[PDB]
Amino acid sequence: MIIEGDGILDKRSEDAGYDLLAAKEIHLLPGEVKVIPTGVKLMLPKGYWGLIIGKSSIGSKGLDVLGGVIDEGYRGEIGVIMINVSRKSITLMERQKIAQLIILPCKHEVLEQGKVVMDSERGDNGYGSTGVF
Amino acid sequence: MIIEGDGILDKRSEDAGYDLLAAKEIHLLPGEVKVIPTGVKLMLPKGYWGLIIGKSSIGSKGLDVLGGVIDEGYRGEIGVIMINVSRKSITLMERQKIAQLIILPCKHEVLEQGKVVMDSERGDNGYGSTGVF
Amino acid sequence: MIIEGDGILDKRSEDAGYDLLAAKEIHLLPGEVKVIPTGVKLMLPKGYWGLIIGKSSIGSKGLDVLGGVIDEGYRGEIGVIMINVSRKSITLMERQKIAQLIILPCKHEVLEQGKVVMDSERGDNGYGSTGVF
Ligand SMILES: [Mg+2]
C-alpha cells in the first residue's frame, strides 16, 4: 500500500491495524472535539476501506474516536476525530499513538426499492430481544 | 440489495458506506440518548452484516453513534442510536444525513471450550505493550 | 474457534456477533472509564481479528465502548473498555450482556513510502463534501 507522510506505522501479520500518530501537539478542552491531523495520505486497495478505531491506552483516558470511515477513493490527509470526555483538558503529544487503521473490505451494491420479506427467525425484533440475560 | 423506505442513499463504488437519513425531526437534550429512526428496512446479503458508524460532519458536532450492529436476519426498521455529548441541545432535521451503513462479512463459528495455547509473539500482552511511543 | 472462560455466547448464523458478558459486578461512576473483564480468552482464525462493538440495550443507557480491537495474536483476557456518559452511577451485573464480538478479516500489507496520485473522483475532498443534504 502506497502511503505519504510519517504518521502511520507498520504492524505485524498477527495484528489487525496500523498505529496512527498525531502530526502535531494537540490540546483538547473538556467536552471538545477536534480533527487530529496525522499527516498521512494513502491509496487503499481497490474494494477496501479504512476504519479508524481507538486504542486501549488512549481510550481508557477519556478520549473517544468519532466517525472513522476512510473511503477507498480518499486522497487527502487522514484526520482522527477525537472528543475529550473528561472534565479536564488533555494534551496529545506530537507523534503520540492516537488511533488504529484497519483495512476492511466493503460490498458495493445498488439499492433496489422492493418489499422486505419476513423470511427470518427474528424478522421484526430488536433492542433487547433476549433480555439482559 | 432490497431496501424499503427512503432513508438511505446509493453510494459510488469507491465509497465505503451508504448515507443514512433521519426519518423525522429529532431533538436531543444535553447528554441524552435517542434511537433516531431512519424509516429503512433491508435484506442484507447472506453472510454479511451492516455496521452503523458515524460521519465526519455530525461527529465533529458532539454527536456519537452507539451500538451499530445490524444483523443479517434483521427485518425491522434501522435505528441510529445517537448520544448528544455537548452541554447544549441539538436538533437533527428530517432527511439530514446522520450516519453511514457499511456492508461487512462476518464469520460464523461454533465455540469450542478448549485450551488457549501461548503460540504467539504477544500472547498475554495488552493495554499499552509498546508504550505511548 | 477455541475459547476459554464462560463470558461469551454462541450466536445463530444470521447474527453478526457474539454476546460478551461481564465477569463480575462492575460499578461505573459518572464519566468514569473501566476495563470490564469478560473472563474470556480465545484463538481467532488466522487472518481475522475481533471487533468489540456495543449492543442496543446498554448503548441507550448512556454507556459506550472504547477501543475494541482484538488482535489475531492476542492470547490474554478480553476486556471491554466502557465509559459511563450519564451524570449518575451505573452498575453492570455479573454475566450481564455488555458488548458484541464480531469476527472480521483484516488485510496485511507493507507500507511503501511513495507518491499519492490524484487518480480519483473525490481525491482531496472530505469533511462534508456533499453538504448536510
Ligand atoms: Mg462511541
Cell of C89: 452511577
The chain A residue lying nearest B121, using CA atoms, is A14
Q: What is the largest CA-CA distance in chain A?
A: 53
- Give the pairing of strands A2-4 and C112-113: parallel
- Taking an 8 Å cut-off on Cβ atoms, the answer to whether A14 and C122 are in contact is no
C102 touches chain A (CB under 8 A): no
Task: Report the alpha-carbon distance of residue C117 to residue B99 in Å, rounded.
Answer: 29
Cell of A108: 458495493
Cell of C61: 443507557
Task: Report the alpha-carbon distance of residue C72 to residue C106 in Å, rounded.
Answer: 9
The chain A residue lying nearest B8, using CA atoms, is A111
Q: Which CATH number fits domain A1-133: 1.50.10.10, 3.40.350.10, 3.40.190.10, 2.70.40.10?
A: 2.70.40.10
- Cα–Cα distances (Å) from B97 to A23, B17, C56, in that order, read 29, 12, 21
- Give the pairing of strands A112-113 and B2-4: parallel
DSSP state of B82: E
Region label for A13, one of left (φ > 0), alpha (ψ between -120 and 50) or beta (otherwise):
alpha
| Domain assignments of chain B as residue spans, ordered by start | 1-133
Out of B83, B106, B117, closest to residue C104 by CB: B106
Cell of C26: 462492575
- Provide the β-strand partners of residue A69: A51
- Cα–Cα distances (Å) from C19 to A63, A69, C57, C97, in that order, read 25, 25, 12, 6
SS3 B50: strand
Residue at grid coordinates 434511537 = B35
Method: X-ray
Task: Report the alpha-carbon distance of residue B90 to residue B73 in Å, rounded.
Answer: 33
Residue at grid coordinates 458508524 = B53
Task: Report the alpha-carbon distance of residue A19 to residue B37 in Å, rounded.
Answer: 35
Q: What is the resolution of this structure in A?
A: 2.5
SS3 B59: helix
In 3D space, the residue among B17, B28, B34 whose CA is nearest the CA of residue B97 turns out to be B17
